[PDB]
Design a protein around this ligand. Sequence first.
Ligand SMILES: *C(=O)/C=C/c1ccc(O)cc1
Length: 100
Amino acid sequence: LAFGAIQLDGDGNILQYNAAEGDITGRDPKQVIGKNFFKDVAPCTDSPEFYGKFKEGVASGNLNTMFEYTFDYQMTPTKVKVHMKKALSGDSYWVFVKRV
Ligand SMILES: *C(=O)/C=C/c1ccc(O)cc1
């Protein structure tokens, strides 16, 4: 696939990936459980532009934001839009990766 759909929790753990990250990169939807997205499966991300914005909704109350971010450090320069929103199926949020 090409569009991404990830589930991150207010701590920083990954729940479920999509068959996009596991398609080209090689991260299956079940390989990221108990894993910190921002450090263990993407150490470029824990910063004020990605992780920071993710945390802004958490720090407030509900999370629902869409910003544009680049994936590098291991991914080739991919420009995506990160639409994160709160979930209740599991204590976490649904963060969507929209590649332009
Ligand atoms: C920053 O370290 C980004 C890492 C990354 C982005 C996208 C992927 O599919 C895999 C790793």
